PDB file of C-alpha atoms in Angstrom:
ATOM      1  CA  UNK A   3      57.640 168.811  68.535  1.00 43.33           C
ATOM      2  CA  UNK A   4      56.221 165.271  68.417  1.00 43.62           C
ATOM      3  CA  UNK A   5      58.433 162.914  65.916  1.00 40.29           C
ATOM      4  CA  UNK A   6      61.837 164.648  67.091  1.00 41.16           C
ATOM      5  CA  UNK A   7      60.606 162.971  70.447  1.00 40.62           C
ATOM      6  CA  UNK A   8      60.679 159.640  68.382  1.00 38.23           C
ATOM      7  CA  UNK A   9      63.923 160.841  67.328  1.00 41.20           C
ATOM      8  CA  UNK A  10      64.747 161.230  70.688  1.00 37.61           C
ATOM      9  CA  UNK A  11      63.495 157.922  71.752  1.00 37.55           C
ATOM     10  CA  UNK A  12      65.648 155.672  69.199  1.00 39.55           C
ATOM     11  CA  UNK A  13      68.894 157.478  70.046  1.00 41.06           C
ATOM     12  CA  UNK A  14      68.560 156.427  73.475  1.00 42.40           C
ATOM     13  CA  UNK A  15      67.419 152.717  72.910  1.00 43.88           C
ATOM     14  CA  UNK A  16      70.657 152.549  70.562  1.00 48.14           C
ATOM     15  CA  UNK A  17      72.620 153.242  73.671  1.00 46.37           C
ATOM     16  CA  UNK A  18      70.980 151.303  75.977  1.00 44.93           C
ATOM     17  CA  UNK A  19      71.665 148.396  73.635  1.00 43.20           C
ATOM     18  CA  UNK A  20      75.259 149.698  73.003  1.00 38.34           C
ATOM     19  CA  UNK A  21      75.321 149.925  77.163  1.00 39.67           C
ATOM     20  CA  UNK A  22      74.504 146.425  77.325  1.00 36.71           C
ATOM     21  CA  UNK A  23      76.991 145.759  74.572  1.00 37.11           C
ATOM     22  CA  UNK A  24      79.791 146.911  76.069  1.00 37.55           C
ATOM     23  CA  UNK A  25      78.890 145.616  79.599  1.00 37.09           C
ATOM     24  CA  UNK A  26      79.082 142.001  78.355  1.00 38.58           C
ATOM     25  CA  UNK A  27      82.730 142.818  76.181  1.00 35.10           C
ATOM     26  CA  UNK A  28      83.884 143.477  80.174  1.00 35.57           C
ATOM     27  CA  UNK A  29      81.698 140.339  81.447  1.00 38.01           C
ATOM     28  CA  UNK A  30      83.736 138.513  78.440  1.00 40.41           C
ATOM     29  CA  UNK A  31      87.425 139.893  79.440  1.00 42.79           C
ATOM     30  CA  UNK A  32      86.614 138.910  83.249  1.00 40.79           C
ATOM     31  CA  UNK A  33      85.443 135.570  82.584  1.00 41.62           C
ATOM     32  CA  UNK A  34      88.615 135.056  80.507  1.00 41.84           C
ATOM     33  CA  UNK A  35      91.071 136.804  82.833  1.00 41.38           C
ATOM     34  CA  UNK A  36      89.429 134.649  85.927  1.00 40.96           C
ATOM     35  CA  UNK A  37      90.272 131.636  83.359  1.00 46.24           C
ATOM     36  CA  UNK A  38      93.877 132.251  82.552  1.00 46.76           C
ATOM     37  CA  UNK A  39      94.760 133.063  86.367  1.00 40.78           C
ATOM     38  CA  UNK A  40      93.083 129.447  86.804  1.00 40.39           C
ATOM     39  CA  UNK A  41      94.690 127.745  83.947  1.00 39.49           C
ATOM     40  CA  UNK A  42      97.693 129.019  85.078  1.00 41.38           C
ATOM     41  CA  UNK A  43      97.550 128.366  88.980  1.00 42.63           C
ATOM     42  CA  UNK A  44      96.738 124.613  88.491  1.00 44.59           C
ATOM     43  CA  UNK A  45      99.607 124.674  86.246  1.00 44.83           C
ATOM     44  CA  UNK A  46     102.095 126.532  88.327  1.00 44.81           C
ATOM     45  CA  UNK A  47     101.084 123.540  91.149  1.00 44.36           C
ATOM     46  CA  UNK A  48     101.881 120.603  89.165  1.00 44.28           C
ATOM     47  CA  UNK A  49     105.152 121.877  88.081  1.00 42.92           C
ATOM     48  CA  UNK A  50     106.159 121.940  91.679  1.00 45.44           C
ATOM     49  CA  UNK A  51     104.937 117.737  91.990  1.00 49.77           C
ATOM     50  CA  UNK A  52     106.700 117.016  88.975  1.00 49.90           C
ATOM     51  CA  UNK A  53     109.801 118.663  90.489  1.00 49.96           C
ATOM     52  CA  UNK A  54     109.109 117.284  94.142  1.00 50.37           C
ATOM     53  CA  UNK A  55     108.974 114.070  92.858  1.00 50.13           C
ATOM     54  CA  UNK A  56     112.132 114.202  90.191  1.00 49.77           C
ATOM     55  CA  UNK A  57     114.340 115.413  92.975  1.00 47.35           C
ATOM     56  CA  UNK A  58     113.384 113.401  95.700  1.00 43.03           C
ATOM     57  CA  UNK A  59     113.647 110.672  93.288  1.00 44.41           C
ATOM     58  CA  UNK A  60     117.413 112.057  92.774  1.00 44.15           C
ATOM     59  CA  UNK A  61     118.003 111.931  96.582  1.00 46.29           C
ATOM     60  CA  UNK A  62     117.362 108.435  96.594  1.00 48.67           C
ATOM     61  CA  UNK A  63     119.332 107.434  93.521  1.00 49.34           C
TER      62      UNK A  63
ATOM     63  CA  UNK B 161     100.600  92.419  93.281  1.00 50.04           C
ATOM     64  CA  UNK B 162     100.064  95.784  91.397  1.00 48.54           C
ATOM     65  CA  UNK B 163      98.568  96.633  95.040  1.00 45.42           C
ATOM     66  CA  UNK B 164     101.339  94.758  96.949  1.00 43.03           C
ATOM     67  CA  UNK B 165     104.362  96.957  95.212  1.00 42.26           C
ATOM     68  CA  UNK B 166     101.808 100.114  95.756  1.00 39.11           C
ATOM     69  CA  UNK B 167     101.840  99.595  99.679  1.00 36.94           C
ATOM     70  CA  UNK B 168     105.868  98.609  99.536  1.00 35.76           C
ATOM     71  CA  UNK B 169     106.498 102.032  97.870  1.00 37.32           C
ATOM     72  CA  UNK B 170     103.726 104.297  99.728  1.00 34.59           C
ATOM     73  CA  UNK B 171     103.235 102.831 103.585  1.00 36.66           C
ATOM     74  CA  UNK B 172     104.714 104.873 106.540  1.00 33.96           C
ATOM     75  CA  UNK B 173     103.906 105.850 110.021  1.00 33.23           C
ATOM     76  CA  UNK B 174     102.903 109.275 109.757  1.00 33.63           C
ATOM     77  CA  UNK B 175     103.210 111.599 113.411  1.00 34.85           C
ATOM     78  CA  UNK B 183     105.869 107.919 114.698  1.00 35.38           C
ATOM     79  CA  UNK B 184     109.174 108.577 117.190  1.00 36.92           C
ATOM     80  CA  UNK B 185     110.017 105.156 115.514  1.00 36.53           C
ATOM     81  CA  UNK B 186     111.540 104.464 111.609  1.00 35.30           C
ATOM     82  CA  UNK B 187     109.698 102.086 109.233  1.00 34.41           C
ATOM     83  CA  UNK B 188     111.007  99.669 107.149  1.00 33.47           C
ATOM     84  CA  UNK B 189     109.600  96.744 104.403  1.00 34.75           C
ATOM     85  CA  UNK B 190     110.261  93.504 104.358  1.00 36.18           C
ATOM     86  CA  UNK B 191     108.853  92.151 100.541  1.00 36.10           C
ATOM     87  CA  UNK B 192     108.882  88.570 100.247  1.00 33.57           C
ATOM     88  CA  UNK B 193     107.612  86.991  96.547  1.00 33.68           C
ATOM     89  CA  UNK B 194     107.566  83.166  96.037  1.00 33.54           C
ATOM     90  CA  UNK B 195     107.848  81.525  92.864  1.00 35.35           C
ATOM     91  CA  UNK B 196     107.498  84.554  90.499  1.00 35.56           C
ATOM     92  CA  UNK B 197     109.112  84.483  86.940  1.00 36.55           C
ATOM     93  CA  UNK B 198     111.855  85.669  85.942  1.00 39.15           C
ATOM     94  CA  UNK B 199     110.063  88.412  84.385  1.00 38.13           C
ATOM     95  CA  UNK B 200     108.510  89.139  87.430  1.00 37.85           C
ATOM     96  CA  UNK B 201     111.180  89.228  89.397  1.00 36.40           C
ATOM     97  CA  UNK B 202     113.139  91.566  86.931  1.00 39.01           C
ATOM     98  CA  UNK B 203     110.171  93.806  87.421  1.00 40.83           C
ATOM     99  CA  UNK B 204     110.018  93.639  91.432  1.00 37.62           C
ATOM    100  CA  UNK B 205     113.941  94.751  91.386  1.00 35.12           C
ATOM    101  CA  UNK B 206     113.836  97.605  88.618  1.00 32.14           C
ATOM    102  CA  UNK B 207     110.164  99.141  90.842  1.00 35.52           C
ATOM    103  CA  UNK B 208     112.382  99.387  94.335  1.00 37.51           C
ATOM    104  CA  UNK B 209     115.501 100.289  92.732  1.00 40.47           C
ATOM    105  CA  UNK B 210     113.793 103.392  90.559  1.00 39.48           C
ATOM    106  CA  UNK B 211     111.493 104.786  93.123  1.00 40.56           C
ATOM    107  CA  UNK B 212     114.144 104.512  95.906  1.00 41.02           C
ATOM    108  CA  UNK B 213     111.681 102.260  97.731  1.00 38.78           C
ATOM    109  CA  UNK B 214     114.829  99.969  98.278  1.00 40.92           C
ATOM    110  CA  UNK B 215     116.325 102.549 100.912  1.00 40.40           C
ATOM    111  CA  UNK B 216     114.006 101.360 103.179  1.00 44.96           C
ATOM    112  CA  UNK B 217     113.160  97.444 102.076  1.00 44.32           C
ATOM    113  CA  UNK B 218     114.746  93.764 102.288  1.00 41.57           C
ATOM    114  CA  UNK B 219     113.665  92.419  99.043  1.00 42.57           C
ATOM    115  CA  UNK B 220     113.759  88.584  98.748  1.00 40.49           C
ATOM    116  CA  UNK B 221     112.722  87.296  95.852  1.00 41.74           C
ATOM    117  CA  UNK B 222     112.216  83.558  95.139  1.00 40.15           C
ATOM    118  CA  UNK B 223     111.639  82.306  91.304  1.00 39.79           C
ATOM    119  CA  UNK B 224     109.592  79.474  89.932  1.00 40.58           C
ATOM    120  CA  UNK B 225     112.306  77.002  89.556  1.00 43.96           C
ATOM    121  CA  UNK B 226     114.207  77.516  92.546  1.00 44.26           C
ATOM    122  CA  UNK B 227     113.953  74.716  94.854  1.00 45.97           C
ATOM    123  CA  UNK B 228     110.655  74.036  96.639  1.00 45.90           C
ATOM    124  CA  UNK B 229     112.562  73.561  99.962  1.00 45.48           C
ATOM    125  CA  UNK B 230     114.462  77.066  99.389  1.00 44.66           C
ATOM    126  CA  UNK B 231     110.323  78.874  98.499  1.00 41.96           C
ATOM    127  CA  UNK B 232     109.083  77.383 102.107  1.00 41.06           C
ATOM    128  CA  UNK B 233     112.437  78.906 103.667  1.00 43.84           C
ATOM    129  CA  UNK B 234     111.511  82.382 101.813  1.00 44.58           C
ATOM    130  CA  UNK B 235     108.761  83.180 104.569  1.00 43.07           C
ATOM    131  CA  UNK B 236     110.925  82.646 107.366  1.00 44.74           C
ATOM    132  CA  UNK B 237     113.888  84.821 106.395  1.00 43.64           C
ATOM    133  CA  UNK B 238     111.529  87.913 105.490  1.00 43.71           C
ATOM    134  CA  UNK B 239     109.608  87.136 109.268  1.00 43.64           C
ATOM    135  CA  UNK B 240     113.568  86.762 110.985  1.00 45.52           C
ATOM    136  CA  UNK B 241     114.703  89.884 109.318  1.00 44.62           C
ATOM    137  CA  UNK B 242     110.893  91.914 110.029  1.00 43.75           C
ATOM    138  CA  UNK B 243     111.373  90.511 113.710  1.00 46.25           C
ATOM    139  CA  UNK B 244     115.288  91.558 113.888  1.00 45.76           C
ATOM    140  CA  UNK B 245     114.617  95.424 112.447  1.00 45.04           C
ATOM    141  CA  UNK B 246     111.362  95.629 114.902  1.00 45.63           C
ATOM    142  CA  UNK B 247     112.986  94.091 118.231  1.00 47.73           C
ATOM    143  CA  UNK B 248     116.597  94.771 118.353  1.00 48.53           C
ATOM    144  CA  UNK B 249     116.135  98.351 116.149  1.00 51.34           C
ATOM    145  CA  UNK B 250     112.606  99.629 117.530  1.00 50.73           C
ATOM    146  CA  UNK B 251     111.176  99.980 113.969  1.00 52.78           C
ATOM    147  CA  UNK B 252     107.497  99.711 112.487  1.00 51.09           C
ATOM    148  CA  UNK B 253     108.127  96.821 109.914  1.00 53.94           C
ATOM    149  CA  UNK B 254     105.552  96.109 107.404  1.00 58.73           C
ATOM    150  CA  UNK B 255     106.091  92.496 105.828  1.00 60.31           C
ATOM    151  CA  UNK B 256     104.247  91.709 102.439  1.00 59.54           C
ATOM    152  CA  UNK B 257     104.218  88.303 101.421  1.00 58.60           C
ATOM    153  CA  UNK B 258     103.063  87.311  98.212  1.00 57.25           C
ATOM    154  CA  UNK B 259     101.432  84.518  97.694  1.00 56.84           C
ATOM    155  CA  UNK B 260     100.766  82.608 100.389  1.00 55.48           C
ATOM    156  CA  UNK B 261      98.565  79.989  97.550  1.00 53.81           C
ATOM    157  CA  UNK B 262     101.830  79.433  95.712  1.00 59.87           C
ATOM    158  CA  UNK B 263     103.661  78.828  99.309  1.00 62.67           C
ATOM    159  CA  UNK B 264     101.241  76.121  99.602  1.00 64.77           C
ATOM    160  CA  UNK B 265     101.145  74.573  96.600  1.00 65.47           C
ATOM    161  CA  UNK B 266     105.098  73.650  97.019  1.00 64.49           C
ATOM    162  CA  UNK B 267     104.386  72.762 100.537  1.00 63.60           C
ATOM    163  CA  UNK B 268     101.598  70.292  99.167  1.00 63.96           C
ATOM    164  CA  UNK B 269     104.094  69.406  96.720  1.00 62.90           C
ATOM    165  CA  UNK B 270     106.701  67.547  99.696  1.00 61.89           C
ATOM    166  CA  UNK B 271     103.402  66.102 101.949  1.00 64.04           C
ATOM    167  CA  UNK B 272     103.261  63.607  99.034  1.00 64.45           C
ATOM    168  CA  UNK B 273     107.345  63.064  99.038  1.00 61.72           C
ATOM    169  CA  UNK B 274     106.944  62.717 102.549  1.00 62.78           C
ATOM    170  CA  UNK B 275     104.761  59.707 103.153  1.00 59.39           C
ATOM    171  CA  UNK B 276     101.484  61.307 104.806  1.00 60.05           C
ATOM    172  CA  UNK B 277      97.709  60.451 104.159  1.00 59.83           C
ATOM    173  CA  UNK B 278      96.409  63.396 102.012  1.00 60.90           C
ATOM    174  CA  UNK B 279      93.782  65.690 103.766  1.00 63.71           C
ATOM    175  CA  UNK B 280      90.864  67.414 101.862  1.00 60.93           C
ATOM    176  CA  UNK B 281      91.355  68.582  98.109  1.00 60.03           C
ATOM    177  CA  UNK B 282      95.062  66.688  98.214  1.00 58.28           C
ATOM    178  CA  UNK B 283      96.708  69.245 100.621  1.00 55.93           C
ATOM    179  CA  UNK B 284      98.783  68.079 103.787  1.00 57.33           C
ATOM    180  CA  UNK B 285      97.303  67.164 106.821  1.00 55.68           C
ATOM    181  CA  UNK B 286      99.291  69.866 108.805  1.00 54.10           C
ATOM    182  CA  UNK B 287      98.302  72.835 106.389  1.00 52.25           C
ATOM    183  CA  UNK B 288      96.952  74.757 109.222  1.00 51.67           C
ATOM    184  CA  UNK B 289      99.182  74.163 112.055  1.00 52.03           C
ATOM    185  CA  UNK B 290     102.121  74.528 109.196  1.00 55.24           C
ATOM    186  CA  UNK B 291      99.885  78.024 108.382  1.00 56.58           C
ATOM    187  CA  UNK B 292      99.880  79.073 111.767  1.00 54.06           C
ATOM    188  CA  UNK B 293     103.693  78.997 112.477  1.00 54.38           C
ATOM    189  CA  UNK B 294     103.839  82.260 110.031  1.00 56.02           C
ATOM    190  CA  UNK B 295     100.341  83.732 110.906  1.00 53.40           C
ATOM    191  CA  UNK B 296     101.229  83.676 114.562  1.00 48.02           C
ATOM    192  CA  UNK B 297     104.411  86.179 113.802  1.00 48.17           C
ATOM    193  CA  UNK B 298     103.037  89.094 113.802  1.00 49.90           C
ATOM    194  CA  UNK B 299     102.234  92.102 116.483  1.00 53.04           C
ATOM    195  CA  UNK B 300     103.675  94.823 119.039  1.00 55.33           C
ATOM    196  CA  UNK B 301     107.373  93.600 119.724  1.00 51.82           C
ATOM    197  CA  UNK B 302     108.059  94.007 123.704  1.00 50.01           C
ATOM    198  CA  UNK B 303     109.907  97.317 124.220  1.00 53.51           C
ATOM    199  CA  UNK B 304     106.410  98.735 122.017  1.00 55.57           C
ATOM    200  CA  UNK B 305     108.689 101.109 120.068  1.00 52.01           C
ATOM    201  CA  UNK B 306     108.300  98.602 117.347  1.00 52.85           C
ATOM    202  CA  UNK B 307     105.609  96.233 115.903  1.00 52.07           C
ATOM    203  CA  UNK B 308     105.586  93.894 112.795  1.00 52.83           C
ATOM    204  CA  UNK B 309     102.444  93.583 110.592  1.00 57.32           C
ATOM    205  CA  UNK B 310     101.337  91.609 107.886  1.00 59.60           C
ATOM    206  CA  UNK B 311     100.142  92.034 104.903  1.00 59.58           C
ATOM    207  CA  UNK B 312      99.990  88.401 103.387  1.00 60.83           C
ATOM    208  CA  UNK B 313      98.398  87.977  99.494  1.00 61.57           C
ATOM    209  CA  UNK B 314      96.404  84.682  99.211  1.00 63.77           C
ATOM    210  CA  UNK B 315      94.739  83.998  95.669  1.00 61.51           C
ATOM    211  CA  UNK B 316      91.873  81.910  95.266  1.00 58.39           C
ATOM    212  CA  UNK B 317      93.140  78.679  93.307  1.00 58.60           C
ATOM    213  CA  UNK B 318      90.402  78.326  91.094  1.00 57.51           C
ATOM    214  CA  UNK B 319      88.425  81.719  92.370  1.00 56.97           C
TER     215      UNK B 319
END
């Protein structure tokens, strides 16, 4: 019966909503991941020219 | 001579069968200055590969017109008799002059333009002309001479 199709329209809107919802929370945690890997690498890096430098330096002396 | 100490500590003669060496000549600097100059080569291990000779303010004029000629003898000795790359930085050529202008006076001449000796450039040219390949061509010595404007 017509009506229980509305019914049947709604709960299907409220997932495509709640399918969108949850296919940003992903977009959110790859963004993020993709950042700390980044913000880590760089990092990692300049340890290594901070170190390059203080032994060489060391050497020297 | 921010850019002068930057070259001393940096320059080299990347893949060269030959070794490189400075040869950092400052005339009359401060005694802050030169306190400076000595603590840069000594903490960046610069001075491995340097002859540092330093030459204050109020050491005698005759001993700052000298100063040249010992950095070009020793650049000349380590490029010739070693086979090295030397790189000679001489700062600053202006204050050379201005003690060389200082004896022309002492020393009876007629004064050329803007009170300076009459033999500036032939003087000039006696540590200009040192420079280039040294025979052998395993070494070379260049210059990299500072020379501030008096008055801009």
């Amino acid at each position: 019966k017509l009506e229980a199709i509305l019914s049947q329209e709604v709960e299907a809107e409220i997932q495509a909503l709640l399918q969108e919802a949850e296919a940003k929370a992903e977009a959110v945690k790859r963004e993020a991941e993709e950042k700390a890997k980044a913000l880590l690498q760089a990092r990692e890096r300049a340890l290594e020219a901070q170190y390059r430098a203080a032994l060489r330096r060391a050497e020297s002396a | 001579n921010e850019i002068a100490a930057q070259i001393a500590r940096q320059a080299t003669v990347r893949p060269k069968e030959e070794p490189f060496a400075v040869v950092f000549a400052a005339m009359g600097i401060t005694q802050r200055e030169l306190s400076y100059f000595i603590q840069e080569f000594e903490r960046t291990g610069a001075l491995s590969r340097s002859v540092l000779f330093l030459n204050k303010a109020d050491d005698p004029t005759i001993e700052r017109i000298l100063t040249p000629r010992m950095a070009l003898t020793v650049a000349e000795y380590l490029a010739f008799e070693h086979d090295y790359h030397v790189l000679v930085i001489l700062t600053d050529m202006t204050n050379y002059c201005e003690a060389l202008r200082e004896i022309g006076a002492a020393r009876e001449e007629i004064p050329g333009r803007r009170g300076y000796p009459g033999y500036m450039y032939t003087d000039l040219a006696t540590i200009y002309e040192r420079a280039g390949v040294v025979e052998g061509k395993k070494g070379s010595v260049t210059q990299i001479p500072i020379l501030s404007m008096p008055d801009d």
